[PDB]
Amino acid sequence: QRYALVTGANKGIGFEICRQLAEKGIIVILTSRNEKRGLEARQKLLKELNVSENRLVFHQLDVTDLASVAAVAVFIKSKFGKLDILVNNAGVSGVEMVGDVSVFNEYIEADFKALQALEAGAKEEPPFKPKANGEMIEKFEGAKDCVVTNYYGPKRLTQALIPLLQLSPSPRIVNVSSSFGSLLLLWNEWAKGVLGDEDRLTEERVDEVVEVFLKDIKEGKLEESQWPPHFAAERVSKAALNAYTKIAAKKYPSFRINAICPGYAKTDITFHAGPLSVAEAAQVPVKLALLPDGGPSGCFFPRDKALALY
Ligand SMILES: NC(=O)c1ccc[n+]([C@@H]2O[C@H](COP(=O)([O-])OP(=O)(O)OC[C@H]3O[C@@H](n4cnc5c(N)ncnc54)[C@H](OP(=O)(O)O)[C@@H]3O)[C@@H](O)[C@H]2O)c1
Numbered sequence: 382q383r384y385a386l387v388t389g390a391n392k393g394i395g396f397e398i399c400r401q402l403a404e405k406g407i408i409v410i411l412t413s414r415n416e417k418r419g420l421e422a423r424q425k426l427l428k429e430l431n432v433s434e435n436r437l438v439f440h441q442l443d444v445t446d447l448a449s450v451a452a453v454a455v456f457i458k459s460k461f462g463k464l465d466i467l468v469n470n471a472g473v474s475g476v477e478m479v480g481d482v483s484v485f486n487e488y489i490e491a492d493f494k495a496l497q498a499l500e501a502g503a504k505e506e507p508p509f510k511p512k513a514n515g516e517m518i519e520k521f522e523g524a525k526d527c528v529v530t531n532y533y534g535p536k537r538l539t540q541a542l543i544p545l546l547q548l549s550p551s552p553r554i555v556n557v558s559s560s561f562g563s564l565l566l567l568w569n570e571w572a573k574g575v576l577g578d579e580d581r582l583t584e585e586r587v588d589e590v591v592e593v594f595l596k597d598i599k600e601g602k603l604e605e606s607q608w609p610p611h612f613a614a615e616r617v618s619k620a621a622l623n624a625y626t627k628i629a630a631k632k633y634p635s636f637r638i639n640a641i642c643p644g645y646a647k648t649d650i651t652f653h654a655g656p657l658s659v660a661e662a663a664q665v666p667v668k669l670a671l672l673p674d675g676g677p678s679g680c681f682f683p684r685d686k687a688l689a690l691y
Protein backbone atom coordinates (compact mmCIF):
# COMPACT_ATOMS: atom_id res chain seq x y z
CA GLN A 382 0.00 0.00 0.00
CA ARG A 383 1.30 3.41 -1.07
CA TYR A 384 0.36 6.82 0.36
CA ALA A 385 0.61 10.14 -1.48
CA LEU A 386 0.24 13.65 -0.08
CA VAL A 387 -0.67 16.40 -2.50
CA THR A 388 -0.54 20.07 -1.49
CA GLY A 389 -2.90 22.67 -2.87
CA ALA A 390 -5.32 19.95 -3.87
CA ASN A 391 -8.75 21.56 -3.49
CA LYS A 392 -8.72 22.77 -7.07
CA GLY A 393 -6.68 23.09 -10.23
CA ILE A 394 -3.90 20.73 -11.13
CA GLY A 395 -3.57 19.40 -7.57
CA PHE A 396 -7.15 18.16 -7.53
CA GLU A 397 -6.51 16.22 -10.74
CA ILE A 398 -3.23 14.83 -9.41
CA CYS A 399 -5.30 13.38 -6.59
CA ARG A 400 -7.76 11.84 -9.07
CA GLN A 401 -5.06 10.22 -11.15
CA LEU A 402 -3.08 8.86 -8.23
CA ALA A 403 -6.21 7.45 -6.60
CA GLU A 404 -7.13 5.78 -9.92
CA LYS A 405 -3.74 4.03 -9.77
CA GLY A 406 -4.65 2.54 -6.35
CA ILE A 407 -2.63 4.96 -4.27
CA ILE A 408 -4.19 6.16 -1.05
CA VAL A 409 -4.27 9.94 -1.45
CA ILE A 410 -4.08 12.55 1.30
CA LEU A 411 -5.79 15.51 -0.34
CA THR A 412 -4.66 18.66 1.50
CA SER A 413 -5.67 22.28 1.38
CA ARG A 414 -5.13 25.40 3.39
CA ASN A 415 -8.86 26.09 3.80
CA GLU A 416 -10.65 23.27 5.61
CA LYS A 417 -14.06 23.81 4.02
CA ARG A 418 -12.65 23.95 0.48
CA GLY A 419 -10.65 20.81 1.07
CA LEU A 420 -13.52 18.87 2.63
CA GLU A 421 -15.77 19.84 -0.27
CA ALA A 422 -13.06 18.88 -2.77
CA ARG A 423 -12.69 15.49 -1.13
CA GLN A 424 -16.44 14.97 -1.26
CA LYS A 425 -16.60 15.92 -4.95
CA LEU A 426 -13.60 13.79 -5.90
CA LEU A 427 -14.78 10.77 -3.92
CA LYS A 428 -18.13 10.98 -5.71
CA GLU A 429 -16.49 11.26 -9.14
CA LEU A 430 -14.03 8.45 -8.44
CA ASN A 431 -16.87 6.32 -7.10
CA VAL A 432 -14.44 4.47 -4.86
CA SER A 433 -14.44 3.55 -1.21
CA GLU A 434 -14.04 6.26 1.42
CA ASN A 435 -10.67 4.91 2.56
CA ARG A 436 -9.04 5.75 -0.79
CA LEU A 437 -9.01 9.51 -0.26
CA VAL A 438 -8.28 11.24 3.08
CA PHE A 439 -8.44 14.97 3.81
CA HIS A 440 -6.15 16.96 6.01
CA GLN A 441 -5.64 20.70 6.35
CA LEU A 442 -2.26 22.02 5.19
CA ASP A 443 -1.09 25.56 4.62
CA VAL A 444 2.48 25.26 3.41
CA THR A 445 3.33 28.72 4.78
CA ASP A 446 2.26 27.86 8.36
CA LEU A 447 4.90 25.93 10.29
CA ALA A 448 2.35 24.53 12.76
CA SER A 449 0.22 23.25 9.88
CA VAL A 450 3.26 21.58 8.31
CA ALA A 451 4.25 19.93 11.58
CA ALA A 452 0.72 18.71 12.25
CA VAL A 453 0.35 17.03 8.88
CA ALA A 454 3.51 15.01 9.59
CA VAL A 455 2.14 13.99 13.00
CA PHE A 456 -1.08 12.95 11.30
CA ILE A 457 0.61 10.85 8.62
CA LYS A 458 2.81 9.13 11.21
CA SER A 459 -0.16 8.27 13.45
CA LYS A 460 -2.50 7.12 10.70
CA PHE A 461 -0.23 5.48 8.13
CA GLY A 462 3.27 5.23 9.54
CA LYS A 463 5.07 6.20 6.33
CA LEU A 464 4.64 8.32 3.23
CA ASP A 465 5.58 7.16 -0.28
CA ILE A 466 4.87 10.20 -2.49
CA LEU A 467 4.92 13.93 -1.77
CA VAL A 468 3.65 16.28 -4.48
CA ASN A 469 4.49 19.91 -3.78
CA ASN A 470 1.83 21.47 -5.96
CA ALA A 471 0.55 24.48 -4.02
CA GLY A 472 1.60 27.79 -5.54
CA VAL A 473 0.62 31.41 -6.06
CA SER A 474 1.69 34.02 -8.64
CA GLY A 475 2.43 37.11 -6.48
CA VAL A 476 0.62 39.31 -9.03
CA GLU A 477 -2.45 41.49 -8.63
CA MET A 478 -4.37 42.38 -11.79
CA VAL A 479 -5.75 45.82 -12.51
CA GLY A 480 -8.17 46.08 -15.41
CA ASP A 481 -8.34 43.40 -18.14
CA VAL A 482 -7.13 40.19 -16.52
CA SER A 483 -6.25 38.67 -19.90
CA VAL A 484 -3.10 40.79 -19.79
CA PHE A 485 -1.78 38.04 -17.45
CA ASN A 486 -2.01 35.61 -20.37
CA GLU A 487 -0.36 38.11 -22.72
CA TYR A 488 2.64 38.12 -20.42
CA ILE A 489 2.70 34.32 -20.26
CA GLU A 490 2.65 34.07 -24.06
CA ALA A 491 5.39 36.70 -24.38
CA ASP A 492 7.48 34.82 -21.85
CA PHE A 493 7.09 31.51 -23.65
CA LYS A 494 8.31 33.15 -26.84
CA ALA A 495 11.19 34.77 -25.00
CA LEU A 496 12.20 31.47 -23.43
CA GLN A 497 12.13 29.71 -26.79
CA ALA A 498 14.39 32.39 -28.26
CA LEU A 499 16.78 32.29 -25.31
CA GLU A 500 16.94 28.49 -25.48
CA ALA A 501 17.80 28.84 -29.13
CA GLY A 502 20.73 31.11 -28.27
CA ALA A 503 19.36 34.64 -28.11
CA LYS A 504 20.99 36.66 -25.38
CA GLU A 505 18.18 38.91 -24.13
CA GLU A 506 14.54 38.77 -23.20
CA PRO A 507 12.69 41.32 -25.36
CA PRO A 508 10.89 44.17 -23.58
CA PHE A 509 7.15 43.59 -23.47
CA LYS A 510 4.06 45.69 -22.73
CA PRO A 511 0.57 44.26 -23.14
CA LYS A 512 -2.10 45.18 -25.63
CA ALA A 513 -5.26 44.94 -23.56
CA ASN A 514 -6.28 47.50 -20.98
CA GLY A 515 -4.85 45.85 -17.88
CA GLU A 516 -1.66 45.62 -15.92
CA MET A 517 0.12 43.16 -13.62
CA ILE A 518 1.02 44.77 -10.31
CA GLU A 519 3.88 43.15 -8.46
CA LYS A 520 4.30 44.40 -4.91
CA PHE A 521 6.35 43.26 -1.91
CA GLU A 522 3.53 41.52 -0.04
CA GLY A 523 2.60 39.41 -3.05
CA ALA A 524 6.24 38.67 -3.81
CA LYS A 525 6.78 37.51 -0.24
CA ASP A 526 3.69 35.31 -0.40
CA CYS A 527 4.95 33.82 -3.66
CA VAL A 528 8.47 33.02 -2.35
CA VAL A 529 7.16 31.67 0.95
CA THR A 530 4.51 29.50 -0.73
CA ASN A 531 6.42 28.38 -3.82
CA TYR A 532 9.96 27.96 -2.45
CA TYR A 533 9.93 27.80 1.34
CA GLY A 534 6.76 25.71 1.29
CA PRO A 535 8.17 22.80 -0.67
CA LYS A 536 11.46 23.05 1.21
CA ARG A 537 9.84 22.99 4.65
CA LEU A 538 7.32 20.29 3.78
CA THR A 539 10.05 18.11 2.26
CA GLN A 540 12.15 18.55 5.39
CA ALA A 541 9.23 17.80 7.71
CA LEU A 542 8.39 14.60 5.81
CA ILE A 543 11.89 13.07 5.39
CA PRO A 544 11.48 10.60 8.31
CA LEU A 545 8.22 9.31 6.90
CA LEU A 546 9.40 9.19 3.30
CA GLN A 547 12.50 7.31 4.47
CA LEU A 548 10.15 4.49 5.49
CA SER A 549 8.90 4.04 1.92
CA PRO A 550 10.54 1.45 -0.35
CA SER A 551 10.31 3.98 -3.23
CA PRO A 552 10.26 7.52 -1.81
CA ARG A 553 9.15 10.09 -4.35
CA ILE A 554 8.96 13.89 -4.28
CA VAL A 555 7.57 15.87 -7.20
CA ASN A 556 7.89 19.64 -7.18
CA VAL A 557 5.43 21.33 -9.51
CA SER A 558 7.64 24.03 -10.98
CA SER A 559 7.73 26.00 -14.21
CA SER A 560 9.91 26.46 -17.22
CA PHE A 561 9.81 30.11 -16.23
CA GLY A 562 12.23 29.17 -13.44
CA SER A 563 14.86 28.84 -16.20
CA LEU A 564 18.03 30.69 -15.33
CA LEU A 565 17.81 32.16 -18.82
CA LEU A 566 14.86 34.28 -17.61
CA LEU A 567 16.20 35.22 -14.19
CA TRP A 568 18.16 38.41 -15.35
CA ASN A 569 20.22 38.65 -12.15
CA GLU A 570 23.75 37.55 -12.99
CA TRP A 571 24.76 36.92 -9.37
CA ALA A 572 21.69 34.77 -8.76
CA LYS A 573 22.10 32.91 -12.07
CA GLY A 574 25.66 32.04 -11.14
CA VAL A 575 24.74 30.90 -7.66
CA LEU A 576 21.77 28.79 -8.68
CA GLY A 577 23.64 27.44 -11.69
CA ASP A 578 26.76 26.34 -9.73
CA GLU A 579 25.40 22.92 -8.87
CA ASP A 580 28.47 21.56 -7.10
CA ARG A 581 28.39 24.47 -4.62
CA LEU A 582 24.62 24.60 -4.14
CA THR A 583 23.41 24.64 -0.57
CA GLU A 584 20.13 25.56 1.03
CA GLU A 585 21.82 28.58 2.57
CA ARG A 586 22.95 29.89 -0.80
CA VAL A 587 19.47 29.52 -2.33
CA ASP A 588 17.86 31.18 0.71
CA GLU A 589 20.25 34.10 0.27
CA VAL A 590 19.21 34.53 -3.35
CA VAL A 591 15.50 34.69 -2.51
CA GLU A 592 16.04 36.98 0.47
CA VAL A 593 18.13 39.41 -1.60
CA PHE A 594 15.31 39.49 -4.14
CA LEU A 595 12.70 40.17 -1.46
CA LYS A 596 14.74 43.00 0.01
CA ASP A 597 15.08 44.55 -3.45
CA ILE A 598 11.37 44.50 -4.15
CA LYS A 599 10.69 45.83 -0.63
CA GLU A 600 13.00 48.77 -1.43
CA GLY A 601 11.76 49.34 -5.03
CA LYS A 602 15.06 48.29 -6.62
CA LEU A 603 14.01 45.45 -8.93
CA GLU A 604 15.19 47.19 -12.07
CA GLU A 605 18.40 48.58 -10.61
CA SER A 606 19.26 45.22 -9.03
CA GLN A 607 18.79 43.31 -12.27
CA TRP A 608 15.72 41.20 -11.50
CA PRO A 609 13.11 40.23 -14.10
CA PRO A 610 10.85 43.00 -15.39
CA HIS A 611 7.70 41.01 -14.71
CA PHE A 612 6.76 37.73 -13.04
CA ALA A 613 9.77 38.45 -10.87
CA ALA A 614 8.71 36.60 -7.72
CA GLU A 615 7.31 33.71 -9.72
CA ARG A 616 10.57 33.33 -11.68
CA VAL A 617 12.77 33.64 -8.57
CA SER A 618 10.64 31.21 -6.58
CA LYS A 619 10.53 28.52 -9.27
CA ALA A 620 14.25 28.89 -9.97
CA ALA A 621 14.91 28.50 -6.24
CA LEU A 622 12.60 25.48 -6.18
CA ASN A 623 14.50 23.90 -9.06
CA ALA A 624 17.76 24.43 -7.23
CA TYR A 625 16.36 22.99 -3.99
CA THR A 626 15.19 19.97 -5.99
CA LYS A 627 18.86 19.34 -6.89
CA ILE A 628 20.03 19.94 -3.29
CA ALA A 629 17.47 17.53 -1.91
CA ALA A 630 18.09 14.85 -4.50
CA LYS A 631 21.78 14.87 -3.55
CA LYS A 632 21.06 14.86 0.22
CA TYR A 633 18.51 12.01 -0.06
CA PRO A 634 20.04 9.78 -2.73
CA SER A 635 17.65 6.85 -2.26
CA PHE A 636 14.67 9.09 -3.01
CA ARG A 637 13.69 10.22 -6.49
CA ILE A 638 13.08 13.97 -6.26
CA ASN A 639 12.26 15.92 -9.40
CA ALA A 640 10.77 19.17 -10.61
CA ILE A 641 8.35 19.41 -13.51
CA CYS A 642 6.47 21.83 -15.75
CA PRO A 643 2.92 20.51 -16.29
CA GLY A 644 2.28 22.70 -19.33
CA TYR A 645 0.11 25.78 -19.67
CA ALA A 646 -3.23 24.76 -18.27
CA LYS A 647 -6.61 26.32 -17.59
CA THR A 648 -6.82 26.99 -13.85
CA ASP A 649 -7.61 29.91 -11.55
CA ILE A 650 -3.95 30.94 -11.57
CA THR A 651 -4.09 31.48 -15.36
CA PHE A 652 -7.63 32.92 -15.46
CA HIS A 653 -8.58 29.65 -17.17
CA ALA A 654 -6.44 30.25 -20.21
CA GLY A 655 -3.91 27.93 -21.74
CA PRO A 656 -4.09 25.03 -24.15
CA LEU A 657 -4.24 22.17 -21.64
CA SER A 658 -7.02 20.89 -19.46
CA VAL A 659 -6.34 20.33 -15.78
CA ALA A 660 -6.47 16.59 -16.37
CA GLU A 661 -3.81 16.86 -19.10
CA ALA A 662 -1.58 19.02 -16.91
CA ALA A 663 -1.72 16.57 -13.97
CA GLN A 664 -0.34 13.78 -16.15
CA VAL A 665 3.14 15.28 -15.75
CA PRO A 666 3.54 15.32 -11.96
CA VAL A 667 1.78 11.94 -11.76
CA LYS A 668 4.34 10.53 -14.22
CA LEU A 669 7.19 11.58 -11.91
CA ALA A 670 5.36 10.42 -8.77
CA LEU A 671 5.15 6.91 -10.33
CA LEU A 672 8.71 6.93 -11.70
CA PRO A 673 10.27 3.44 -11.40
CA ASP A 674 13.21 2.86 -9.09
CA GLY A 675 16.47 4.00 -10.62
CA GLY A 676 14.92 6.72 -12.71
CA PRO A 677 16.26 10.29 -12.93
CA SER A 678 16.54 12.33 -9.74
CA GLY A 679 17.39 15.97 -9.16
CA CYS A 680 16.16 17.01 -12.58
CA PHE A 681 13.72 19.48 -14.09
CA PHE A 682 11.45 18.07 -16.81
CA PRO A 683 9.23 20.08 -19.15
CA ARG A 684 5.97 18.39 -20.10
CA ASP A 685 6.97 16.46 -23.21
CA LYS A 686 10.24 15.22 -21.73
CA ALA A 687 8.45 14.11 -18.55
CA LEU A 688 5.84 12.14 -20.47
CA ALA A 689 8.52 10.44 -22.58
CA LEU A 690 10.50 9.26 -19.55
CA TYR A 691 8.94 5.82 -19.59
N1 LIG B 1 -1.76 26.32 -14.70
C1 LIG B 1 -0.51 26.46 -15.34
O1 LIG B 1 -0.49 26.78 -16.47
C2 LIG B 1 0.74 26.15 -14.52
C3 LIG B 1 1.86 26.03 -15.28
C4 LIG B 1 3.03 25.75 -14.65
C5 LIG B 1 3.07 25.51 -13.31
N2 LIG B 1 1.92 25.62 -12.56
C6 LIG B 1 1.95 25.37 -11.10
O2 LIG B 1 0.95 24.44 -10.89
C7 LIG B 1 0.72 24.58 -9.39
C8 LIG B 1 -0.82 24.43 -9.22
O3 LIG B 1 -1.40 25.68 -9.60
P1 LIG B 1 -2.75 25.65 -10.52
O4 LIG B 1 -2.47 26.00 -11.94
O5 LIG B 1 -3.46 24.40 -10.30
O6 LIG B 1 -3.44 26.91 -9.89
P2 LIG B 1 -4.73 27.11 -8.90
O7 LIG B 1 -5.92 26.54 -9.56
O8 LIG B 1 -4.64 28.46 -8.48
O9 LIG B 1 -4.39 26.12 -7.65
C9 LIG B 1 -3.48 26.52 -6.69
C10 LIG B 1 -3.70 25.58 -5.47
O10 LIG B 1 -2.56 26.02 -4.54
C11 LIG B 1 -3.28 26.27 -3.24
N3 LIG B 1 -2.47 27.17 -2.42
C12 LIG B 1 -2.04 28.43 -2.55
N4 LIG B 1 -1.39 28.85 -1.49
C13 LIG B 1 -1.41 27.72 -0.69
C14 LIG B 1 -0.87 27.63 0.58
N5 LIG B 1 -0.18 28.53 1.36
N6 LIG B 1 -0.95 26.44 1.27
C15 LIG B 1 -1.62 25.47 0.64
N7 LIG B 1 -2.19 25.51 -0.58
C16 LIG B 1 -2.05 26.71 -1.23
C17 LIG B 1 -4.44 26.87 -3.69
O11 LIG B 1 -5.44 26.86 -2.58
P3 LIG B 1 -6.66 27.98 -2.42
O12 LIG B 1 -7.80 27.43 -3.11
O13 LIG B 1 -6.76 28.09 -0.95
O14 LIG B 1 -6.12 29.27 -3.02
C18 LIG B 1 -4.88 25.88 -4.82
O15 LIG B 1 -5.39 24.65 -4.22
C19 LIG B 1 1.30 25.77 -8.96
O16 LIG B 1 2.55 25.50 -8.19
C20 LIG B 1 1.72 26.55 -10.23
O17 LIG B 1 2.83 27.36 -10.03
C21 LIG B 1 0.74 25.93 -13.18
Ligand SMILES: CC1=C(C=O)C(C)(C)CCC1
Pocket residue numbers: 472473474489558559561562612615616619650651
Ligand atom coordinates in the same frame (compact mmCIF):
# COMPACT_ATOMS: atom_id res chain seq x y z
C1 LIG C 1 6.00 30.50 -12.83
C2 LIG C 1 4.84 31.24 -13.49
C3 LIG C 1 3.40 30.73 -13.15
C4 LIG C 1 3.18 29.44 -12.27
O1 LIG C 1 3.51 28.45 -13.00
C5 LIG C 1 2.28 31.32 -13.89
C6 LIG C 1 1.71 30.40 -15.03
C7 LIG C 1 1.13 31.51 -12.89
C8 LIG C 1 2.66 32.79 -14.51
C9 LIG C 1 3.85 32.83 -15.22
C10 LIG C 1 5.11 32.47 -14.23
